[PDB]
Write a protein that binds this ligand. Structure first.
Ligand SMILES: CC(=O)N[C@@H]1[C@@H](O)[C@H](O[C@@H]2O[C@H](CO)[C@@H](O[C@@H]3O[C@H](CO)[C@@H](O[C@@H]4O[C@H](CO)[C@@H](O)[C@H](O)[C@H]4NC(C)=O)[C@H](O)[C@H]3NC(C)=O)[C@H](O)[C@H]2NC(C)=O)[C@@H](CO)O[C@H]1O
Ligand SMILES: *[C@@H]1O[C@H](CO)[C@@H](O[C@H]2O[C@H](CO)[C@@H](O[C@@H]3O[C@H](CO)[C@@H](O)[C@H](O)[C@@H]3O)[C@H](O)[C@H]2NC(C)=O)[C@H](O)[C@H]1NC(C)=O
Length: 361
């Protein structure tokens, strides 16, 4: 099985223990580590952070400890305007320039492949996404003629049915991608004012509409659209989504006034790292949706939907039972990487729990 793990560039700036650099990563934990995110300047792939070349070097040195480890560089991300992707892919000329710049860049910095994170392709982009993937892969096949191992090509894809129907030709891109990571953790819409879990595994007998917003549905749908199980990887979150309650009601349906207050280290309203959640739990009230198989917690007027060792192991077994290629984790820097916040004298408790299940067969 594959265990795809993302590492984010901006995590280096978090204060104190929250600060995470590539060398904190256990070389034997994941099978693939993806660095997020690369930028595109003058239609060419390029660095993002001022010290990226140094961090690229630090990450790729892990391969001197674990020779089987593969690394990829992801282009795009949520702070990358999708309009920019749309513009590059729409014109055969700009598209070709970008494609041509990738192999040399990856080779120079020691990466084994490219991960595409266009979030998200609209109805008018579907056509061009296919061309982009097809042509990128053709370039990689051609570059391998030089005697070096062929570069890998992957893509992170929405798990939302409407988003999938709208911007992706799944059957077509599946044949050219080495693997596809399903973003099965952004299910509760940032649009409404209700409490809800962002990464439920199952539908849950307690609600008719949005039977589409759960991991099981997204996986089944992808398989029906033509994506081979051996290329599908299920996304598992290492963070939680928080809300500020509008009333004393804490159960399903409870009204929301807005996102939860920022975590001390992550400082982003709406989300908390797993290590911050481990601290939050002290004095909190824990619950678990039996139908969806995921937990949530509450303290004061703060409501948090998250994943723990149990739910993560649960998703990993589901994935194996469906014979998928493996799991993808977002993200290493949000798990208890130091292993000092979540009790168990264990580094990367969430990611390790996933690895354990995958190692069972
Ligand atoms: C849950 C989750 O992971 N969601 C992701 C989004 O959070 C993510 O958006 C990213 O948001 C983070 C934090 O909110 C943001 O981090 C900032 O990164 C910049 C660098 O790009 C830092 O700026 C540096 O400051 C120091 C001094 O303080 C300078 O020395 C340095 O030169 C600066 N860098 C630059 C630009 O020159 C900020 O300090 C840091 N701020 C925070 C909040 O700590 C990221 O930039 C956002 N990511 C990107 C790629 O823009 C979103 C990104 O796509 O993806 C989700 O996964
Ligand atoms: C990711 O790539 C972006 C696309 O190139 C880049 O956007 C910006 O690109 C240039 C460079 O800063 C900005 O302005 C130009 O810069 C030169 C100065 O060297 C000027 O002479 C020229 O007139 C022009 O102003 C753009 O304003 C900006 N592009 C936009 C917003 O359309 C991003 O900077 C890059 N991201 C990071 C963090 O590296």
């Amino acid at each position: 099985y594959k265990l795809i793990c993302y590492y984010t560039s901006w995590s280096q700036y978090r204060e104190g223990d929250g600060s995470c650099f590539p060398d904190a990563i256990d070389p034997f934990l994941c099978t693939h580590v993806i660095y997020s995110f690369a930028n595109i300047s003058n239609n060419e792939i390029d660095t993002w952070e001022w010290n990226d070349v140094t961090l690229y070097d630090t990450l790729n040195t892990l391969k001197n400890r674990n020779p089987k480890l593969k690394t990829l560089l992801s282009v795009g991300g949520w702070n990358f305007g999708p309009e920019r992707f749309s513009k590059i892919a729409s014109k055969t000329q700009s598209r070709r320039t970008f494609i041509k710049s990738v192999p040399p860049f990856l080779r120079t910095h020691g990466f084994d492949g490219l991960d595409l994170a266009w979030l998200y392709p609209g109805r008018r982009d579907k056509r061009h996404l296919t061309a982009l993937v097809k042509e990128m892969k053709a370039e990689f096949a051609r570059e391998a003629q030089a005697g070096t191992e062929r570069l890998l090509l992957s893509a992170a894809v929405s798990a939302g049915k409407i988003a999938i129907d709208r911007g992706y030709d799944i059957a077509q891109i599946s044949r050219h991608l080495d693997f596809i990571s399903l973003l099965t953790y952004d299910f509760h819409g940032a649009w409404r004012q209700t409490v809800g879990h962002h990464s439920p595994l199952f539908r849950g007998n307690s609600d008719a509409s949005s039977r589409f917003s759960n991991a099981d549905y997204a996986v089944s749908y992808m398989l029906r659209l033509g994506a081979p199980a051996n290329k599908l990887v299920m996304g598992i979150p290492t963070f939680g989504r928080s809300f500020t309650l509008a009333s004393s009601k804490t159960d399903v349906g409870a009204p929301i006034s807005g996102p939860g207050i920022p975590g001390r280290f992550t400082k982003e309203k709406g989300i908390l790292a797993y290590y911050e959640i481990c601290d939050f739990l002290h004095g909190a009230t824990t619950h678990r949706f039996r139908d969806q198989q995921v937990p949530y917690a509450t303290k004061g007027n703060q409501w948090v939907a998250y994943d723990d060792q149990e739910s993560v192991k649960n998703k990993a077994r589901y994935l194996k039972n469906r014979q998928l290629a493996g799991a993808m984790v977002w993200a290493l820097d949000l798990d208890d990487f130091r292993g000092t916040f979540c009790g168990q004298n264990l580094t990367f408790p969430l990611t390790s729990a996933v690895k354990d299940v995958l190692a069972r067969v």
